[PDB]
Amino acid sequence: GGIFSAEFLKVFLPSLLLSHLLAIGLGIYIGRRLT
Amino acid sequence: GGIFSAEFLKVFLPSLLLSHLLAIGLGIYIGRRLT
């Protein structure tokens, strides 16, 4: 059993998706701004 | 409880971390490729 469970899961699964998208964006940002 | 739980989780937590790292890496590769 988890403590937060709902409060955590409610904003966990969807977070992973958003995080991935943002992560990739960061990579491009750095590259595009190399020189 | 569930069948795996411990085992499954043992190979689920460290995955999220690796995913994030890889995600950012991909983004960079794309950017540096265009520039």
d(CA B26, CA B15): 16
Maximal CA-CA distance, chain B: 52
Q: How far is B9 from chain A (nearest CA, A)?
A: 13
Which residues of chain B lie closer than 8 angstroms to A20, CB-CB? 19-20, 23
| Sign of the CA dihedral with A27 first, then A21, A23, and B9 last | negative
Residue in A20, A28, A34 nearest the CB of B30: A28
- Number of independent structural domains in chain A: 1
- Which technique? NMR
- Give the burial class of B26: count Cβ atoms within 10 A of its Cβ; 0-12 exposed, 13-18 middle, 19 or more buried: middle
Query: What whole-number distance in Å separates Cα of residue A28 and Cα of residue A30?
Result: 5
- The partner residue sitting opposite B30, judged by closest CB among A16, A27, A34, is A27
Alpha-carbon dihedral sign for residues B8, B12, B13, B14: positive
Range of the domain at B33: 1-35
